[PDB]
């Protein structure tokens, strides 16, 4: 059982918030009934449903922030790339490709020609 | 030490939970090689040294 992720994504934040506070309610009363019956595996689906809603709530919030910071430098660090420490510090392909005027003229004038040795 | 720090009392709780025999349903799983709780401790023979 439990709530599925895809149909939650069609909701809004207030509906999700109402869903969450409702979800936390039964987990309370399932927990008090857990000590009554010898076993109750139904609580597992309840807790997972809370996680699914919480992920959905977070997912919507970040995307709206991403749209807010779209198209301008200095985005929040957690929304940046998490490749490595080294790669983030590495030279970008633009700056690595930069070359002085003296060398650019030599490359354009004298590139490595394609030659064949048969005759 | 009746008057003890919370850190020591936190190590207290885990030791209480550790000291418990093997659950019986562990015996019945397929390819079960565990015979008993080998890491059992008792206050008379082994001290925690914490």
């Amino acid at each position: 059982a439990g709530v599925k992720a895809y149909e939650l994504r069609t909701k809004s934040k207030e509906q999700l918030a109402s869903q969450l506070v409702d979800l936390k309610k039964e987990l309370a009363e399932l927990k008090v009934q857990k000590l009554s019956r010898p076993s109750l595996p139904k609580i597992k689906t309840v807790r997972k449903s809370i996680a699914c809603v919480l992920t959905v709530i977070n997912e919507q919030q970040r995307e709206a922030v991403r749209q807010l910071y779209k198209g301008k430098k200095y985005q929040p660090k957690d929304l940046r790339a998490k490749k490595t420490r080294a790669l983030r510090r590495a030279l970008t392909k633009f700056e690595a490709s930069q070359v002085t005027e003296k060398q650019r003229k030599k490359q354009i004038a004298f590139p490595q020609r394609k030659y064949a040795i048969k005759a | 030490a009746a008057q003890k720090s919370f850190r020591i009392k936190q190590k207290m709780a885990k030791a209480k939970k550790q000291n418990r025999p093997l659950p019986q349903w562990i015996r019945l799983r397929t390819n079960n090689t565990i015979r008993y709780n080998a890491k059992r401790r008792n206050w008379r023979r082994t001290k925690m040294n914490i």
Binding site: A81, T84 | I50
Partner: protein, 85 residues
Amino acid sequence: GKGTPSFGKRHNKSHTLCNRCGRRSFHVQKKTCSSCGYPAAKTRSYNWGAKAKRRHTTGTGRMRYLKHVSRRFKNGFQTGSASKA
């Protein structure tokens, strides 16, 4: 009576738990751990202690974050998500 009678007077922990390694080797008076070198920034380690390095080297723990870096590298550190092929 340096033997049994003297052994009875041992009730003062010279060391306690280390905040960094949790070994019960933190010297209370010296305020320095004798195992991991806390509070010094560098972790205590010696090349003559070949066994000692092996006990606390990387791999003996969880690699809470470094487990997946090889998996991430194999995919070339892709970004985004799948597309329901």
